[PDB]
Design a protein around this nucleic acid. Structure first.
Lengths: 323, 323, 323, 323
DNA sequence: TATAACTTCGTATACGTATGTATATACGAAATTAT
DNA sequence: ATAAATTCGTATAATGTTACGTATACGAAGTTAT
DNA sequence: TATAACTTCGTATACGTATGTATATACGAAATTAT
DNA sequence: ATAAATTCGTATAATGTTACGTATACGAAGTTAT
């Protein structure tokens, strides 16, 4: 089958476009860490031996990696073999048993997921006070971005692809914006998040000083060098990383600067506006389903993960007990 | 396996009544196109070669075929091979991966599934207000049909199968159409579709002027020739092509001829009342479960898909941000 | 494996108590009809050949047997072989294809399930007028039975096992009765259907004239010969058939006597009081779940099969259309 | 397969952390009883013989063991053989049929599963009204525990795992216990159990007098010696046997010693608050979905089972029959 | 000083879930380009 | 002979669950800071 | 008498379900027992 | 040199679907009682 595996790998690469470029990066990252460990421990890297993958998994656990990550590592290895025509490591009792041991142990050892910091109206209003009067182009853009986000529950990559033309005007002195949001045959070509009155005036103060209006193709948000001059572009969009940074920086301008321990989730992030908006919607009392829509959600659970600790979403028992 | 395949193909044909006429229609159709491509490239048409099927699916993609239809061509190919004892083409990395790729590329290219132009309440009320005055048998039938289609959400093939004996009455006086043919197979007696008093009146008027009640085995709907003379029958039933034609004509009767764009769903089709009734219920509250019941749905995707466009925006976060 | 099948059959008979006696009767009935057909057509009866079972199935269809029955026949045959260590007929493509053909055909040929006649308050009140003054012991018992049934949605076999002691008195001048209803670890030891004021007086007029009170063990309902003398017994209960007959007879005393065509479901039956009571509950507007309980129901569907044509359970579309 | 089994058994023991301590506890327990019976009858204990296992299960039945426990003995036997590569006893008609039989015979004999004596609101309010006045640390802990048990419906093992760091507050001031260990495995962060203001006050008072907050890694609940001195710890946690003891003592403190009937659930056990809270919600409306959420249920059987006894009768058909 | 309050234990029995992968966000960090 | 059922055969409607663990129930013996 | 109103057809594409068995009721009919 | 990003690697949270049919969409040719 040495020729069959050869063909299979030729098949995978031939139709690599069958998977996202980022998806491949993930697989490459695993194969990199796995192969390396093998070289350091003297173990055939491909195909992988059950006992080998068992030792490797037990290794990742020590590295302190969460279960979700260890599973992903195994997963990539599994598919790599399945699509290679070879036996998958997860098909061996050794690996199956070790994965169960790790998941159980780690869970009992107190393994908490990763919560995200919330960016609510109280934070958006405090900021809306600090960087609302600044004449700095950077500040004018950051606020606009912080507006669209919170007000549209939009994802980062989504706000990054937004173009000037993608934004229309209607329903009064307010604004309109329609993006993609979804994509696999079944989806909603597009929706139409509409900025409020007190957000459109922030997005206009940005387009006027940025000049993104000099070409409907130009993305709404662009670059802004140290000189304070924007760089409107209809060919390149702001990296999601950059947008994420706008969150961390804003949070820095207010609550100091992160913390020593790399404990992971100290400042605001790409979805700090989504979690926040949802909670704010739940606070004012809004049907969960209604909150589902606002943020293109379809997994009540996830939405219930941001507003659970929300003191209204307390539960029946509490209402029963409290008369 | 070389003659066992012949027998398998023979057993499938013997009990061919096990599959719908449409399945066979598509089967032989796909085989025609696939065999045609094979001929133009001097290749074996059966059994198919995974590499060859890959070239074929990519050929369909090139022809501009939709993703859902490319999958159909693959689906029939898989069936003919599975129901024949041979390995399915999809059992190959080449085919399996190229199908995922084509799906991506196309989707990312903007492609998306289409749905029948909606036929909501306003439409029904408008068409009714225009044809309820006609005494023509054709007009009396088309109006009762559309009323049944909207009210019952039934598909055109089910509506065309309704026999006089199936119709019944209630304690309130409203008709009750019994649908004898459910696809969630077991023994669900069938749904007893109830009509509104106003809609029952429409059907009642048609039955009269049509005299289909001459035989309780007659099909509720029949053809009406030029001289406005009904042609009831208990054997043959109005072709679904005729029912789709009513939807198309009732649309042209109000909006005129459709552009020569060639596009699909430029007018009402056999599913218009379905997608239209679902939205009307959703937009007017109506719990999702009841909606499922109404349209006879056992899932959730489709019902949602037909809506997602109405009460998207308006108020929500905006109203919250303002005051 | 001739010895393995021998052992297996010895296993099945050894632990025959693993199945209900009636369940076995069913299996015997199938094996009887199957073997007979084989003898008449010259075909090995056990083990069964795919083509053989195919011909047999195709035969039952001609006999005019519904799909549910034909499936049962196959089912018994399947298990017989599975538990015999032999291959099941349903495991062959021939039989699998034929079953699909039959189910599809019959369904398209207009195969309606079997509906039961309803015994509602209007029927119970009309009867309560006819046989309420009669001094005949038979009449006094029949009415009492017709009372418990309608008022308790109880099953027949359940009303048959009822004993005098199983009936207590409380909640005023009313009566109380607790039976089994369920039984497989998870269940409700028992419930407690309570007769109304205008039903308890009917059950007492029976116990006083029957004398079932001369032993708490004695079943509530007993025999009543032509002489008009009851036969209280704590060892033997009234056959379900007898109770069913009380339904048919009552229906006879009023709407003539059945009909020529053995069309199956002309008079009332063992559950004519359940279907009726439910509908009556739905009429007065009662939460489906509430109706579920009353009749130990847990399958909303079934309950929705009795009250569907109930003109209140019309649907959303109707409410929408009717303003 | 003769040494492969040894390795399999070796791999299971190596990664024994893959299974719960209770699974292993039951495993070795069942093996003790099974091996004991084998010894008394001069038979091989492993691998087990289907005929021998049959004699064993029937032996348990004879001993009067419950159906659920007989199934446990079969369950462990099956695991030890499957996880060892050998065929499971249940893969035999003898065992499979005898288990169905025993289930029937026992059930039909009247046997039924039992459930913990309920601990509803009235009970909690009563116990509270009696211990809320005590200053003893033991009394202050037991009252906070019962309050947490009722309010949160949490099991005793989860309640015993709660660490101080897990407790948090809300916008209203009510505590929020984070449960870090869910069995519907993926990454459900966990449930954030919210307490009522009144119940939070109870916990707050205990934390104080216990000084467990001395270490946020300390277990919310610890032991309290004779001198009323708390003994916090971040390593060892209050034994579940101790928590069950609180339920038993709080019951004896109100109803005195339980009869020497030997029966189970003669007093409140670790599941009392669970079954008790479920009914309290059901009896007070509360949609089933919310109930599931409260008790952390993902199904429907158990929740229902805990109720079915309340609003059974009363009114319903009776009220309808009367007037 | 015997003792309250558990902890550990073993057999009996009730309670419960049932997916793995492709894709996007996190985010500290190295690379890049224009002030 | 026949009312009133009971027992039978079998079509057909309504009900109900398997597999593999994991956690609680509880009397009894062993532990420990008082 | 050409023609409204379909029917039949074939390729293109959207819509949809996913269980089988053990047990109880049906019910016409033969068997049974006491008036 | 450095603000402002972009590109990279990879831990980790959130999203989403396969298999096998079955039915509709619609322009075009053939059918038939007027």
């Amino acid at each position: 089958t040495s020729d069959e595996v050869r063909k299979n790998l030729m098949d995978m690469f031939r139709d690599r476009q069958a998977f996202s470029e980022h998806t491949w990066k993930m697989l490459l990252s695993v194969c990199r860490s796995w192969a390396a460990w093998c070289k350091l421990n003297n173990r055939k890297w491909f195909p992988a031996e059950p006992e080998d993958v068992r030792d490797y998994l037990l290794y990742l656990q020590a590295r302190g990696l969460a279960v979700k990550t260890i599973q992903q590592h195994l997963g990539q290895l599994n598919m790599l073999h399945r699509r290679s025509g070879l036996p998958r490591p997860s098909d061996s009792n050794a690996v199956s048993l070790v994965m169960r041991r790790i998941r159980k142990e780690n869970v009992d050892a107190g393994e908490r997921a990763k919560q995200a910091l919330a960016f609510e109206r109280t934070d958006f209003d405090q900021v809306r006070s600090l960087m609302e009067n600044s004449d700095r182009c950077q500040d004018i853009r950051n606020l606009a971005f912080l507006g669209i986000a919170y007000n549209t529950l939009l994802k980062i990559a989504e706000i990054a692809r937004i173009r000037v033309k993608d934004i229309s005007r209607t329903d009064g002195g307010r604004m309109l914006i329609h993006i993609g949001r979804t994509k696999t045959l079944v989806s909603t070509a597009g929706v139409e998040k509409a900025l409020s009155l007190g957000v459109t005036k922030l997005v206009e103060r940005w387009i006027s000083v940025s000049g993104v209006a000099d070409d409907p193709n130009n993305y709404l948000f662009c670059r802004v060098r140290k000189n304070g001059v924007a760089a409107p572009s209809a060919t390149s969009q702001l990296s999601t990383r950059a947008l994420e940074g706008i969150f961390e920086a804003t949070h820095r301008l207010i609550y100091g600067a992160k913390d020593d321990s790399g404990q992971r989730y100290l400042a605001w992030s790409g979805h700090s506006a989504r979690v926040g908006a949802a909670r704010d919607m739940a606070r004012a009392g809004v049907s969960i389903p209604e909150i589902m829509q606002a943020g293109g959600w379809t997994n009540v659970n996830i939405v219930m993960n941001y507003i659970r600790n929300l003191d209204s979403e307390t539960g029946a028992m509490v209402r029963l007990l409290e008369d």
